[PDB]
């Protein structure tokens, strides 16, 4: 029963043509459920259950929060640029925070920020001070430590975040707890006197999965080239693992798939 509530913000100076410079998105158990950007200027549901369990007051307050964050992030982007003596170009501020209810019933919380891809400031694990990864973040820390910001975010992460995460897990229990089996497909192609075998798993949920290439009944280790778990458009996931062998030698290899939706691991073979 691992549950997570996460919010991430991105504030850019060079977003791209026709792209919002400020974007905030929220995830419950890895599933995107709320979204705000500087173009629509409104918090919007991204799942049916969050819209079906909230009133207009919720979205109005969230939209107010989002617009206030837009203004604050504009100013913070400018400040971070000037502490580096920077006048223009591609500069970005990133925020990532939230809370986790882990399987032992314990609580975890985090709130970290980044400037131009690298760490800038973060609330430390005791949630009592702010740690500045760069000197340019030391002024902010000072200000944030005289405004009682560490305790504010501690109270948010340890309470508000956790209770609203409990509400979200209630609202989306059927969706978050669902199981969708992967469609697996083994394929083979030969080139330069080498046989590349590939095993693709499509449309599985939840995200954790293991796809291994067995040779002669033994799990291969660093010989398999995996692509990681990548997203589908519909909230499911996809993965693919390849392995190189000799021209022929095809019956030696098997694909094994271990997932929460399969009571026993699936085994698949090539059929040319």
């Amino acid at each position: 029963e691992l549950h997570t509530l996460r919010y991430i913000r991105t504030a850019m100076t060079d977003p791209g043509p026709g792209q919002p410079w400020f974007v905030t998105v929220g995830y419950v158990d890895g599933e995107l459920f709320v979204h705000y950007n500087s173009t629509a200027r409104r918090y919007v549901p991204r799942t049916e259950w969050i819209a079906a369990n909230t009133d207009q007051q919720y979205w109005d307050g969230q939209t107010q929060i989002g617009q206030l964050n837009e203004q604050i992030n504009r100013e913070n982007l400018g400040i971070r640029q000037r502490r580096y003596n920077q006048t223009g170009g591609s500069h970005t501020v990133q925020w990532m925070f939230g809370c986790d209810i882990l399987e032992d019933g314990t609580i975890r919380g985090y709130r970290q920020s980044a400037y131009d891809g690298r760490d800038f400031i973060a609330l430390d694990k005791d949630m009592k001070t702010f740690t500045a990864a760069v000197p340019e973040a030391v002024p902010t820390k000072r200000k944030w430590e005289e405004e009682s910001e560490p305790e504010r975010w501690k109270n948010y992460l340890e309470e508000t975040c956790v209770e609203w995460l409990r509400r979200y897990v209630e609202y989306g229990k059927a969706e978050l707890g669902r199981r969708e089996r992967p469609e697996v497909r083994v394929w083979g192609k030969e080139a330069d006197g080498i046989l590349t075998l590939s095993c693709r798993a499509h449309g599985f949920y939840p995200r954790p999965i293991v796809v291994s290439w067995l040779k002669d009944g033994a799990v291969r280790g660093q010989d398999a080239h995996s692509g990681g778990i990548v997203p589908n458009g519909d909230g499911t996931y996809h993965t693919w693992v390849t392995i190189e062998a000799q021209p022929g030698d095809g019956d030696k290899y098997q694909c094994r798939v271990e997932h929460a939706s399969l009571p026993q691991p699936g085994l698949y073979s090539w059929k040319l």
């Binding site: 989002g66 964050n69 948010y156």
Partner: peptide
């Protein structure tokens, strides 16, 4: 729910 960031 989201919450507002602090001023830097």
């Amino acid at each position: 729910i989201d919450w507002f960031d602090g001023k830097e």
